[PDB]
Design a protein around this ligand. Structure first.
Ligand code: CL
Length: 251
């Protein structure tokens, strides 16, 4: 199964007022997720993006969080994680979500979906989501899967106008209070390869993508930071904003 990094979710309260410092990453207004009462703004990088997410209809999201789908859904994590701002999850791209569902189901991993999804464009974009429902404990919310209705790469020719090619996502850093468990689960669910193992962290990689996934020991369990290679940077820097860390590195 060919998996690639699709997007990272950052929960930001009062997202309509929000912009990145010095407009380092340009943003484009997204749409509204009718099922959940959430809306987004998108930071297109290169064949992947940053999804900034907020809640417009709180009563709808709270209702939805109490359902079975709500126990796993990306939007309802806002409620379940007590409205704490920051990176919520990562989403992995597939061209065959049914093959992913069958592969996980053949390993007895309880899945939710495929869930049909849509949002209107400012001029309709469709996709399906599939979630992992771990019966055991999760320190880290499991990454979820996406299959865009639009073909690959029919999506790359439509969004190339928005891609900011000076940037390239390199690494996603996850802090876990149970690294051993997080690694074991991610190797099982995502068919990842082991890159590095030491007393502090484990680096993982998808078989069909160049992004590193660093799971490091921490006093917290969370999606912590993203490392973005910046072609226009001469010196590294980090931006802490609304509970998330965006690290920028030259080359
Ligand atoms: Cl975990």
């Amino acid at each position: 199964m060919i998996l690639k990094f699709d997007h990272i979710i950052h929960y930001i309260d009062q997202l309509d007022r929000f912009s990145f410092p010095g407009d380092v990453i340009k943003l484009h207004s997204g749409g509204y997720h009718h099922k959940y009462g959430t809306f987004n703004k998108l930071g297109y990088i290169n064949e992947n993006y940053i999804e900034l997410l907020d809640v417009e209809n709180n009563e709808k999201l709270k209702k939805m969080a109490k359902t079975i789908e709500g126990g796993v859904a990306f939007a309802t994590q806002i409620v379940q994680e007590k409205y704490e701002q920051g990176f919520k999850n990562i989403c992995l791209h597939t061209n065959d979500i049914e093959a992913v569902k069958n592969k996980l189901q053949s390993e007895q991993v309880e899945v939710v979906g495929p869930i049909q999804m849509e949002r209107d464009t400012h001029k309709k974009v469709k996709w399906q989501l599939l979630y992992i429902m771990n019966q055991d404990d999760d320190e880290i919310k499991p990454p979820f899967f996406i299959q865009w209705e639009e073909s690959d790469s029919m999506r790359t020719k439509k969004l190339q106008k928005y891609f900011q090619k000076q940037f390239s996502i390199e690494t996603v850093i996850v802090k876990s209070k149970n690294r051993s468990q997080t690694v074991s689960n991610w190797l099982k669910w995502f068919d990842m390869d082991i890159v590095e193992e030491n007393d502090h962290y484990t680096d993982l990689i998808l078989k069909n993508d160049d992004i590193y996934f660093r799971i490091e020991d921490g006093k917290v369990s969370k999606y912590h930071s993203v490392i973005i290679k910046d072609a226009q940077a001469t010196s590294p820097y980090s931006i802490f904003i609304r509970g998330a860390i965006y690290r920028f590195e030259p080359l």
